[PDB]
From TrEMBL, chains A, D:
Protein name per its UniProtKB record: Gamma-tubulin complex component
Stated family: Belongs to the TUBGCP family.
Subcellular localization: Cytoplasm, Cytoskeleton, Microtubule organizing center, Centrosome
Domain of life (superkingdom): Eukaryota
Function field: Component of the gamma-tubulin ring complex (gTuRC) which mediates microtubule nucleation. The gTuRC regulates the minus-end nucleation of alpha-beta tubulin heterodimers that grow into microtubule protafilaments, a critical step in centrosome duplication and spindle formation.
Self-association and partners: Component of the gamma-tubulin ring complex (gTuRC) consisting of TUBGCP2, TUBGCP3, TUBGCP4, TUBGCP5 and TUBGCP6 and gamma-tubulin TUBG1 or TUBG2. TUBGCP2, TUBGCP3, TUBGCP4, TUBGCP5 and TUBGCP6 assemble in a 5:5:2:1:1 stoichiometry; each is associated with a gamma-tubulin, thereby arranging 14 gamma-tubulins in a helical manner. Gamma-tubulin at the first position is blocked by TUBGCP3 at the last position, allowing 13 protafilaments to grow into a microtubule.
From TrEMBL, chain B:
Protein name: Gamma-tubulin complex component
Keyword Endoplasmic reticulum applies: no
GO biological process, one term: mitotic cell cycle
Stretches assigned to the Gamma tubulin complex component protein N-terminal domain: 9-250
Gene this protein is translated from: LOC108708438
Organism: Xenopus laevis
Keywords assigned by UniProt, alphabetized: Cytoplasm, Cytoskeleton, Microtubule
Main location: cytoplasm
Keyword Phosphoprotein: no
Full-protein residues shown: 259 to 701 of 1019
Gene Ontology CC annotation, any one: gamma-tubulin complex
Similarity annotation: Belongs to the TUBGCP family.
Subunit structure: Component of the gamma-tubulin ring complex (gTuRC) consisting of TUBGCP2, TUBGCP3, TUBGCP4, TUBGCP5 and TUBGCP6 and gamma-tubulin TUBG1 or TUBG2. TUBGCP2, TUBGCP3, TUBGCP4, TUBGCP5 and TUBGCP6 assemble in a 5:5:2:1:1 stoichiometry; each is associated with a gamma-tubulin, thereby arranging 14 gamma-tubulins in a helical manner. Gamma-tubulin at the first position is blocked by TUBGCP3 at the last position, allowing 13 protafilaments to grow into a microtubule.
Length: 175, 282, 51, 175
């Protein structure tokens, strides 16, 4: 069921995985052609698509509170979905070279995202629970990039570097 | 039932050109959804059906942008900035169409999804400008306050998006495409208001709120709403040129930083080189 | 080795050397997985399947 | 069916697309070798050939009411069919290099004409419903060239410029 799981990963609803929009989920497993083990991993695979649409609502609220650094933080977050979406199209040719490969390699690529996607979701939840506005998102992400997780500490430094460029804009025009 | 796999995505790439169709139920502007069918119990179950629900929202904005097109110039040039940008969106559309008609194609559902992904971000910032643009059209008495607060939200959008980005100047120019063209008929009335002495303001809508009163002793009354000193230099000069027609006498983006208030502070001496030369003649 | 990388997660706590040690140990964990990628390609049809 | 659609676009009748002359159409789709989707776009493709023969009747009435500016308006309208007919012959070599290409590129070229051809058809319909005669076609086209649509505002300025040349003739011979 190769195409059903890449597209449950993009965040769009179904009637096997019934989804209303952007916050709510019903699992609906009265399914005959998956096993009781194999629906447990689809719940493991949906938790990495749940935070991906908890992410686009953070985009459309700021792109398309307030502040000039909120959307400066948005072109930081598009770079963390960019190898994510680059990995979504490399799974596409995997399903065309042989359309009989089972789901465990797709599980394997998403155990790679398993420590990037919650570790940024705990960041935005700590962001929205202090009700931050202005430069102090940049200080919040600076003590978040104080943390380790070497793929993630570069990622919260890339989100740091783009809104430091908007800081870099300011004292350039002021002088 | 079985619908055509890797060909329904070429048939949504179809829809995105010719926007009203039957494979996709874009019946109205508010609701654009796709239903193909559930496909079979091997070979791409539901992932491909999840991807079609994504692109349903991306054919939704182009149906909204075409519905904005109908057949002041400021409202028309803000409409033609939408349409002049479309041919840069329609050029890639024929590229991937040329790739899949040419065998072999070596593409699938997922390996095309990153090619239109830089365009995917460019079409969503198109949504934000026009959604924050029209919000008071079903309210009545729009005329000048709708023009003033949609220019304001255009200016609010260029402060939020250009000044935070600047890693790619290709979208920096794109938000300047929407600015320099809408301001140009808002300029060409000001050129007519000085070197010719008279201005054009329609009756159904209103613009910059300059209007000549019908008596001769009255000079000029500014409409009340119901750079700004440089606009007051336009007001006194066009008054003074209205007098004079009554008188019978005798490289890199990151070094260019940034961006629109520097060009505006170039336009104010361009206003200035006429405001400074009119008062010499007065 | 995998539970060592689960205990690895810090901001960067009590040492700049400690998890960079484990950064190389994830590289040596990574080398074990490529040697598992040759094994499964033996299993399906596309040698002998003996122990 | 490459040649059938360029020539349904020129405005001449058929017995699949039965057409009497210059005003009336029957769609007649009991067709086996087109799909129910593909006849809907032939109705989209016929609507750009319907106004093209609503156009030649405006020619033959004036060339071959009355006034000296009615046919001055005619050599304005031949310039708007001239890149149209230039595009008709560039589709011809498209059908000779490979005669297997389907109809969507021909749909694509006619979405380019989709905002030139109604926007001049609303002009001539507003012309004939006021029963205009003389200089006041030139004032009608001047507030039509007051409109935007940057390809079309140049087109109604080219139709403005040619009958302003007949105005330019008059005060040259009068002086």
């Amino acid at each position: 069921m190769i195409h059903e799981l890449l597209l449950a990963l993009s965040g769009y609803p179904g009637s096997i995985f019934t989804w209303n929009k952007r916050t709510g989920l019903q699992v609906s497993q009265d399914i005959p052609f998956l096993h009781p083990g194999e629906t447990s991993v689809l719940n493991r695979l949906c938790k990495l698509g749940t935070d991906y649409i908890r992410f686009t609502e953070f985009i459309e609220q700021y792109t398309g509170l307030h502040g000039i650094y909120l959307r400066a933080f948005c072109r930081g977050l598009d770079s963390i979905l960019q190898p994510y979406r680059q990995a979504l199209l490399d799974l596409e040719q995997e399903f065309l070279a042989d359309p009989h490969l089972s789901i465990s390699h797709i599980n394997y690529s998403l155990d790679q995202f398993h420590l990037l996607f919650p570790s940024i979701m705990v960041v935005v939840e700590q962001i929205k629970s202090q009700k931050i506005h202005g430069c102090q998102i940049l200080e919040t992400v600076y003590k978040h990039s104080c943390g380790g997780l070497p793929p993630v500490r570069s990622a919260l430094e890339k989100t740091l570097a783009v809104c430091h460029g908007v800081m870099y804009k300011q004292l350039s025009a002021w002088m | 039932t079985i619908v055509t796999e890797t060909q329904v995505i070429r048939e949504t790439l179809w829809l995105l050109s010719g926007v009203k169709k039957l494979l996709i139920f874009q019946l109205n502007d508010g609701k654009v959804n796709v239903r193909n069918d559930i496909i079979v119990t091997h070979m791409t179950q539901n992932c491909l059906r999840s991807v079609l629900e994504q692109i349903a929202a991306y054919g939704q904005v182009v149906f909204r942008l075409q519905k904005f097109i109908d057949e002041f110039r400021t409202y028309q040039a803000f409409m033609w900035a939408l349409y002049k940008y479309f041919i840069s969106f329609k050029e890639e559309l024929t590229e991937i169409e040329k790739c899949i008609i040419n065998k072999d194609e070596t593409v699938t559902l997922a390996i095309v999804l990153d090619k239109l992904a830089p365009r995917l971000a460019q079409l969503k910032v198109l949504h934000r400008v026009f959604s924050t643009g029209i919000a008071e059209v079903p309210p009545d008495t729009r005329n000048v306050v709708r023009a003033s607060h949609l220019l304001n939200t255009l200016y609010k959008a260029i402060l939020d998006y250009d000044n935070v980005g600047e890693a790619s100047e290709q979208t920096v120019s794109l938000l300047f495409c929407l600015w320099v063209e809408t301001v140009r008929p808002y300029l060409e009335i000001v050129d007519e208001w000085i070197v010719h002495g008279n201005l054009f303001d329609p009756a159904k809508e209103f613009i910059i709120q300059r209007n000549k009163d019908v008596p001769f002793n009255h000079r000029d009354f500014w409409y009340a709403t119901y750079l700004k000193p440089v606009l007051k230099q336009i007001i006194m000069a066009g008054k003074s040129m209205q007098l004079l027609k009554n008188l019978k006498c005798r490289s890199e983006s990151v070094t260019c930083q940034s961006f629109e208030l520097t060009l505006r502070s170039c336009l104010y001496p361009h206003i200035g080189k006429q405001y400074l030369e009119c008062c010499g003649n007065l | 080795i995998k539970k060592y990388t689960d205990q690895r997660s810090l901001d960067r706590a009590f040492g700049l050397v400690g998890q960079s040690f484990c950064a190389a140990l994830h590289q040596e964990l990574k080398e074990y997985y490529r040697l598992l990628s040759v094994l499964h390609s033996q299993l399906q049809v596309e040698s002998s399947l003996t122990l």
